[PDB]
Amino acid sequence: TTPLVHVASVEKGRSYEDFQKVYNAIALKLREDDEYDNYIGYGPVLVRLAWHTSGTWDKHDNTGGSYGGTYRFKKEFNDPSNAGLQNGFKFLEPIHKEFPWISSGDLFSLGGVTAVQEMQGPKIPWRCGRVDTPEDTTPDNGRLPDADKDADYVRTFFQRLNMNDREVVALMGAHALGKTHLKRSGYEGPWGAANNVFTNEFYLNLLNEDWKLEKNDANNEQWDSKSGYMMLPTDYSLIQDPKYLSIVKEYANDQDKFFKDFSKAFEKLLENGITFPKDAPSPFIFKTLEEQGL
Ligand code: HEM
């Protein structure tokens, strides 16, 4: 069928102040619910939820993507690739209850932006206007990437999301956050030490740790260091491919450049598939709780 156009439609009468209140409620709950996942907190799972709800997009026919908020439907929430994201969704449930006017796509993507900023990451400009679409618009399972693959796979996979080498390497830096959980993905361990603070640690660890190719308890191969860190085969592919390797070295040597490129690629990922009218509001830059003295 003919590719649909998804036009951003501002939640009736809402403006920056309304969305800053939603950001604040998410940020305050991130601070309060600090026990989750052995005190990592919900920041990393909210970033992963924003990426997986956006990552289903197909540039060829504009199916999937963040616009429709379709993760709320069983086919997508039960995608094996989304195992564990129910924690991010449950976190956002009281937020949606307090702000019922926000669309599901706007909430999932805003959860990601809030988590990155609250974890001292870069500012991520964010635009409102995603509109909930019906159950039959839910994309099928299998549009999210496999972790047991090589650089050729990663590069080809991300062409579907209209991401180039620099955008892919910058986006993968989010693997500074959280960890792999054996029961969710068949991989186990964190990528680094500060896994609830957004830094360029992922690139420094790729380049500086002594990695060993081992089998985990799920019988899957992963790269492990004596420091207690791990890398997926797709992460390690970033230092196997010479084009990705040059970009990894750039981000490992320039925190500000990584922040600036991640911010652009992450906003692009969250906005793929959406048509913003010429007279839509400009993207919002939310203040963090710290900047507000809250
Ligand atoms: C080649 C592409 C990618 C692959 C194969 C991949 C794979 C995975 C895997 C297997 C996990 C562990 C899931 C679990 O066991 O809990 C994970 C976690 C995570 N992913 Fe990625 N990912 C990719 C790209 C990305 C991107 C583009 C982002 C965001 C920009 C992202 C953000 C995260 C975050 C924050 C976590 C930690 C979640 C948590 O701690 O609960 N990933 N990823």
Curated annotation (Swiss-Prot):
Provenance organism: Saccharomyces cerevisiae (strain ATCC 204508 / S288c)
Residues annotated as the enzyme's active site: 52 (proton acceptor), 191 (tryptophan radical intermediate)
One GO term describing the cellular component: mitochondrial matrix
Enzyme class (EC, first level): oxidoreductase
Additional comment: Present with 6730 molecules/cell in log phase SD medium.
Primary site of residence: mitochondrion
Cofactor annotation comment: Binds 1 heme b (iron(II)-protoporphyrin IX) group per subunit.
Whole sequence portion shown: 68 to 361 of 361
Residues with site note (Transition state stabilizer): 48
UniProt EC number: 1.11.1.5
Catalytic activity: 2 Fe(II)-[cytochrome c] + H2O2 + 2 H(+) = 2 Fe(III)-[cytochrome c] + 2 H2O
Family stated for the protein in its record: Belongs to the peroxidase family. Cytochrome c peroxidase subfamily.
GO biological process, one term: response to reactive oxygen species
Impact noted for substituting residue 191 to F: Substantially diminished activity
Protein name per UniProt: Cytochrome c peroxidase, mitochondrial
Cofactor: heme b
UniProtKB keywords: Heme, Hydrogen peroxide, Iron, Metal-binding, Mitochondrion, Organic radical, Oxidoreductase, Peroxidase, Phosphoprotein, Transit peptide
